[PDB]
Amino acid sequence: KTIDYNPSVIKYLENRIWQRDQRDMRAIQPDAGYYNDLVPPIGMLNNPMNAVTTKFVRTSTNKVKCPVFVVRWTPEGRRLVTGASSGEFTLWNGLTFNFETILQAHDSPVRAMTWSHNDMWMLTADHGGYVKYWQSNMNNVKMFQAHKEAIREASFSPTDNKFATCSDDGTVRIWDFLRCHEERILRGHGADVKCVDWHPTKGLVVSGSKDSQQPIKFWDPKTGQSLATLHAHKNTVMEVKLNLNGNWLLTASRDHLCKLFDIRNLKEELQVFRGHKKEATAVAWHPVHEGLFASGGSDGSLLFWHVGVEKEVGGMEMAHEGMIWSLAWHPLGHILCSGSNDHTSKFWTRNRPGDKMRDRYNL
């Protein structure tokens, strides 16, 4: 059982020559016989409702049955490494998702996992406080200790030089890559910080919190001074994410809301994203469709959103079992993964043309 992206790219490269746009594109008709006309989401660049991935594929479960926290794709899209509570990296295949290999990276629940802007390095943190580097062949390279308490999220610069680890002691510590050197400490946050995203051009660091007085703090990695403070949510921002364009700040919290913010204009507020009947615990921006993102819930509500529409585009209420911790789109924006608070992890792809969506997830 497979979801192969090759017959869509080959169809896209053959349409590319005589299609100049999407207004020129021959329309896919809702039938089970037009299966060859699927193009990847580079092709239909507008109509981003394409990559609302509500067709189930496969539950990737382990034999050890541990609840997973971070799931990220290898940046060539080749395989899915998975960070579980036992510190095990279970590498899932990328097309026929059977199994590839299992590791035991950390001595703690893995809390953070990022790939670099090239395919070279992989930063992983854990619940003890240790930060390891990982080559693309999953070889353990130089480890150190970043915090004395549990690290929660890493992310880094528009180059491979300088990462930031946020932890449960309340400090966002900014690290050098090659020297493993703690460059500076960003204190004055109020309570434990649970998410950090680095800005893709300008060199900002945006932090979440549990503290209600200082919920979101902008930073500056060169000076170390807090640039500005955003008061956005009533309690406990779970994730903070940024686009690849760098204009927008997206923030999920425990007050059943997701909120957009223009980082050029903090005094006002962009639109809000309701509909999570329980807490909104995870956000993954879509890679090619700017403005559309999936969303996890603490009850299991997997929702899809778009910037401009007040209601959601459409997702899965009560359908993914457990609490969702992290999500990761494939480098082509066509398939999606979710990491449960259960011992499972499920893969979601786009709906086929002409099918009756009558299964247990849609209707």
Binding site: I10, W18, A27, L38, N245, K356
Partner: protein, 1177 residues
């Protein structure tokens, strides 16, 4: 690093078309437009479109509309450009270019609404009554342009600040009736996807917003909210019926505010997807998804479907001007259109990018119509893969030229109009008979009793005559005076009397027998044309002769007032003329620097330019001119061209009417040509292979052609060196042909080669395949072409993966059902001898298989004296949907000469496939590296070694997502990914190891890659999805990269069109190759590397040319050639703007060089060396 972009071929493929009052309110004009180029067409009567104006832009036309302003004498045009630019332009009388009325820059950070990536294109729409005009900016803003100084200041209407929350918009039109300019808008408040129709059945809506110009408010009237989910364009039904028709992919609606929504279905695919109440249209099963449509008068609608099929919908109207039902009929098929326009009642233009856009003619059948095809417009379509090849029939006199002799073969068009295009630059003549005649420097051919009888050669001391006919032979008897040189010899009357002129005397003639003799400062040149002879001496004296029957030449000494001495002359007559106030005209250039046109029976001054030899752009009435020629060219000798020779520089003029003088002015037209007793250089010819025009003699010969298209055509001729003299020639053993001298004194009887077509900007043979041309590959051994093709068959099965085998499912539906298109591939074999496909040579592939690449792979072997053999290799893999694992197959082919079947000379070549084995995954690209096949299967790049029968694996690397292009030179493999980047490789040969050197770290969606080659600098030229070019270099010692890992872009340039093909040719500059490319919107371009010291003298020119010249549509040539914004390291010069340094007059040419600090003698040596080195193909 330092380069220049030059454009060898203008782009073909029209996107837009309309029918407006471009020149004047009296007649109308087809105004078509394409990628950054605008054309204006008249209509002559068999009917044929005639070109009337052509305009080039520094920006791609994204929309176009025409609305006639209040009080204006013409119809202005509303040109929409990329990232929200509107530009109102008009035709100008007086000067003949475009006058720009307005500009409107609407690119703001606060209008993009936070979205960086612009997806929506701007769309201009206008009123039927000419009240306002609207532009949809970004999909979120409407810009209203009120009309009655003729404009009113605009105001931007926010779309999402209206009622009903517009969101996705589809199409917007203005409606008819409606005293206020009502704007209808299709939109989708909740957007959905075909394929996700169970939770969103149909969400398409219509709001007809009524725009108050004065109050600047706008209330919503007439909303509908449940149209089917996939609606394409809406069409405003004209005034007596009104309303709108809304096309859908599977249905068709008619909507009006009082009438209930009447809508029918077309095929049974609206069963479970559309809950809108739809009827069943009888006996019709079609789809309206990429359909262009227009209204014939009223209540009739011509619809060009996809597939090219033309239907006529009649709106069946009741008595109350309501609509009862629809009626369809299948008329004749035509081109895959991108536009649709009714002209004059009876005609339809079908503007197509892919395929020849043609003109139709419809008459009723005895309300059912039938369509006839009038004269088409030639079009090189979306050039997908193109291969450089050698011609077949080059003559044996030209065999030892040192430059390569080669031509390019282009997979143009798509689908039904899929074709090959054999493109070729400078004309290669067929030499059928040659001589060796020294001493004679001039030549003439006159007609004796319409074949040419006499060849009149002028030596420095005597005169040769030749008698022609069956066997051409030198003439000895009386007639022509052979005792001295002859300065001109031509027919007078109507091919009955011959007249030659010697420097002492002026002889009539009737053939071999002299009629009589007229004696006269030696005569230097004559003008013997149109029963009037004018003879000019060396001191500047002019005398005129005239035939008078009793026929005899009569002296009429002209009344002329010589304040300065005449330098040169011309005579000219009007068969279909514009010279109003057949009539004969004398053109006369004095030495003070003026031009004087003379009406010939009298000698009154009619036209006068006070400063002629400069080279001014547009002339109006009241150095060292060599030769001046006025000639008519075109249909019925319609439009005249002026051609002068001033200081080693050729400048040609048009003529256009403009209001007791001549009602004409002369507009200058651009060039690519430099000129670096009296001998004429501008030698007019009529009917050489049917083509009329001028041959231009000199160090670079150029055929000037104007056909019935009305379009000027300059074709060079670089073989056989510079050409000294020329004459038309019609004989028995030589057909309609021509006759010239070599510089080494060799007369050549010649005929144009008949397989090409010289009406196009390059001589091109368009070879119809009636199937899509995907790839082409010249095989050097045995000299043939291998083309991968595809044709559309209806699909019937659906593959599955059930765990043990594949199980197919038959598509079993209703009889009223359109089928999915299954494409079957086949590899052709094309002969260059005659361009028919070679019979019994076609490799036909599997049931679902797709050629992803074909190249001419040079693998090494143990047979020949070299290592290499040059095979043809195809990588091909099966598309059976996403739920089936895609696997591939490498297909290596060898073209082998066999004995021919009798009666079939083309069948001496046949494929022999050495290798055909299914691989482990999809094969996406192929290459050769020192005799090693380099293939990219999946996410690995294997490197094979072909033994006697099989491939053996040697090395690989784990690469990125979908490597679709690969090239190489000297064990450096370059790759190209769909999403990520290029990633250059390297192959140590001694150990079987392949390695990654460097890669572009940024994400970038690449079309195709090349190798910019300098002396030691190797650039990596890359075209991407935004219409750009960029050169990456591997520079380890630099510090802005990392150490040997990151690539660095060094040159940026925004070409206006996509690029798939790339050719490296040597240079006609020690080792600087030209990296040619053929743009996907029709044209062909170049990149020529330069030195830095030459580069920065021209960067200072271009910055002055950008500011100090009034460009078309008020555009900016600098901002158009900036990277991706339509972090910029620009190092490529805009050689289509530097080419506008030649077009400036030499007074204005010297002002720019004094403002930048050099002399124009250097800059012409700077520019024209880039034209000389790039005269390939």
């Amino acid at each position: 690093m330092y380069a220049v972009y030059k454009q060898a071929h203008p782009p073909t493929g029209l996107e837009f078309s309309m029918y407006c009052n471009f020149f004047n309110n009296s007649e109308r004009n087809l105004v078509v437009a394409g990628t950054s180029q605008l054309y204006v067409y008249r209509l002559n009567r068999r009917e044929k479109l005639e070109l009337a104006a052509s305009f080039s832009f520094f920006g791609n036309v994204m929309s176009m509309a025409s609305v006639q302003l209040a009080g204006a004498k013409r119809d202005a045009l509303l040109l929409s450009f990329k990232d929200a630019k509107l530009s109102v332009v008009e035709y100008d009388p007086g000067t003949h270019d475009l006058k720009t009325l307005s500009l409107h820059y609407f690119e703001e950070p606060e209008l993009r609404d936070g979205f960086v990536q612009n997806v929506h294109t701007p769309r201009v729409r206008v009123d039927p009554d000419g009240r306002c005009a609207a532009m949809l900016v970004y999909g979120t803003r409407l810009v209203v342009l009120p009309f009655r100084s003729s404009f009113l200041p605009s105001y931007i209407i926010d779309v999402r600040a209206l009622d009903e929350k517009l969101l996705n918009i589809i199409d917007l039109q203005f409606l008819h009736g409606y005293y206020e300019p009502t704007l209808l808008i299709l939109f989708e408040p909740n957007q959905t996807w075909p394929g996700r129709v169970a939770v969103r059945q149909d969400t398409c809506s219509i709001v007809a917003i009524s725009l108050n110009i004065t109050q600047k408010v706008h209330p919503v009237i007439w909303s509908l909210t449940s149209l089917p989910f996939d609606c394409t364009q809406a069409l405003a039904v004209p005034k007596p019926i009104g309303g709108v028709v809304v096309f859908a992919v599977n249905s068709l609606l008619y909507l009006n505010q009082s009438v209930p929504p009447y809508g029918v279905a077309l095929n049974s695919l609206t069963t479970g997807t559309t809950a809108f109440p739809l009827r069943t249209q009888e006996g019709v099963r079609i789809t309206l998804d990429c359909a262009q449509a227009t209204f014939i008068s009223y209540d009739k609608m011509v619809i060009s479907l996809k597939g090219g099929e033309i239907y006529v919908l009649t709106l069946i109207t009741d008595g109350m001007r309501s609509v009862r039902a629809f009626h369809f009929d299948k008329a004749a098929a035509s081109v895959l259109t991108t536009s649709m326009v009714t002209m004059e009642p009876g005609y339809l233009f079908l503007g197509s990018r892919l395929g020849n856009s043609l003109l139709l003619k419809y008459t009723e059948k005895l309300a059912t119509y039938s369509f006839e095809v009038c004269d088409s417009i030639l079009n090189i379509g979306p050039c997908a893969n193109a291969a450089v090849g050698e011609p077949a029939f080059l003559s044996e006199e030209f065999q030892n030229s040192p430059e390569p002799d080669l031509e390019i073969v282009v997979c143009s068009g798509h689908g039904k109009n899929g074709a090959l295009s054999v493109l070729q630059k400078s004309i290669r003549p067929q030499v059928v008979t040659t001589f060796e005649l020294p001493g004679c420097y001039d030549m003439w051919t006159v007609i004796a009793p319409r074949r040419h009888g006499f060849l009149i050669l002028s030596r420095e001391d005597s005169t040769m005559i030749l008698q022609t006919g069956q066997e051409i032979m030198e003439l000895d008897t009386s007639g022509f005076a052979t005792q001295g040189p002859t300065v001109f010899a031509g027919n007078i009357g109507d091919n009955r009397y011959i007249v030659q002129v010697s420097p002492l005397g002026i002889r009539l003639l009737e053939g071999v027998n002299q009629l009589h003799f007229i004696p006269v400062a030696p005569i230097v040149q004559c003008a013997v044309a149109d029963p009037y002879v004018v003879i000019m001496s060396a001191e500047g004296h002019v005398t005129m002769f005239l035939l008078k029957s009793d026929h005899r030449l009569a002296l009429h000494k002209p009344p002329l007032h010589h304040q300065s001495k005449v330098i040169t002359l011309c005579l000219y007559r009007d068969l279909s003329g514009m010279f109003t106030t057949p009539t004969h005209w004398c053109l006369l250039v004095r030495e003070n620097g003026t031009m004087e046109i003379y009406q010939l029976p009298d000698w009154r001054l009619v036209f006068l330019v006070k400063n002629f030899p400069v080279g001014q752009r547009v002339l109006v009435d009241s150095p060292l001119v060599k030769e001046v020629l006025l000639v008519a060219l075109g249909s019925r000798q319609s439009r005249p061209y002026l051609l002068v020779h001033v200081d080693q520089e050729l400048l040609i003029y048009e003529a256009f009417p403009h209001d007791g003088n001549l009602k004409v002015r002369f507009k200058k037209v651009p060039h690519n040509i430099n000129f670096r007793g009296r001998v004429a250089r501008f030698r007019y010819f009529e009917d050489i292979y049917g083509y009329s025009g001028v041959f231009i003699c000199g160090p670079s010969p150029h055929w000037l052609l104007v056909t019935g298209r009305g379009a000027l055509r300059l074709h060079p001729m670089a073989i056989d060196g510079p050409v000294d003299s020329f004459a038309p020639f019609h004989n028995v053993n030589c057909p309609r042909g021509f006759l010239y001298f070599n510089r080494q004194g060799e007369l050549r009887i010649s005929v144009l080669p008949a397989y090409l077509s010289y009406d196009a900007p390059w001589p091109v043979r368009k070879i119809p395949l009636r199937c899509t041309a995907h790839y082409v590959a010249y095989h050097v051994e045995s000299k043939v072409y291998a083309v991968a093709t595809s044709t559309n068959t209806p699909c019937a099965r659906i593959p599955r993966m059930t765990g043990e085998e594949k199980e197919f499912e038959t598509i079993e539906r209703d009889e009223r059902y359109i089928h999915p298109q299954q494409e079957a591939f086949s590899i052709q074999l094309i002969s260059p001898v005659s361009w028919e496909a070679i019979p019994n040579a076609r490799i036909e592939l599997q049931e679902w298989e797709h050629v992803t690449c074909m190249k001419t792979v040079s693998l090494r072997s143990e047979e020949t004296v070299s290592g290499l053999k040059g095979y043809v290799a195809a990588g091909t893999c099966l598309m059976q949907g996403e739920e089936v694992t895609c696997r591939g197959r490498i297909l290596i082919m060898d073209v082998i000469e066999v004995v021919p079947e009798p009666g079939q000379p083309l069948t001496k070549n046949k494929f022999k496939v050495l290798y055909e084995k299914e691989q482990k995954g999809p094969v996406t690209a192929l290459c050769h590296c020192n005799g090693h096949l380099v293939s990219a299967i999946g996410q690995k790049i294997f490197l094979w070694s072909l033994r006697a029968s099989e491939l053996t694996g040697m090395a690989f690397i784990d690469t990125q997502l979908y490597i679709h292009q690969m090239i190489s030179v000297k064990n450096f493999i370059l790759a190209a990914d769909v999403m990520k980047s290029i990633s250059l490789l390297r192959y140590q040969e001694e150990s079987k190891t392949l390695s990654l050197v460097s890669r572009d770290a940024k994400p970038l969606e690449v079309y195709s890659v090349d190798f910019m080659v300098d002396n030691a600098q190797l650039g990596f030229l890359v075209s991407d999805r935004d219409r750009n070019l960029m050169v990456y270099m591997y520079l380890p010692e630099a510090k802005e990269s990392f150490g040997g890992m990151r690539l660095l872009r060094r040159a940026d340039f925004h070409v206006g069109a996509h690029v798939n093909t790339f050719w490296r040719t040597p240079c006609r500059w020690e080792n600087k190759h030209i990296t040619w490319f053929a743009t996907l919107d029709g044209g062909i371009g170049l990149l020529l590397p330069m030195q830095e010291k030459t580069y920065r003298r021209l960067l200072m020119l271009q910055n002055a040319l950008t500011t100090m010249l009034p460009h078309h549509a008020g555009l900016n040539p600098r901002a158009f050639r900036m990277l991706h914004v339509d972090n910029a390291v620009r190092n490529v010069l805009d050689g289509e703007l530097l080419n506008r340094y030649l077009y400036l007059s030499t007074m204005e040419r010297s002002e720019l060089a004094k403002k930048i600090g050099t002399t124009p003698d250097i800059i012409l040596d700077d520019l024209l060396e880039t034209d000389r080195v790039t005269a390939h193909f």
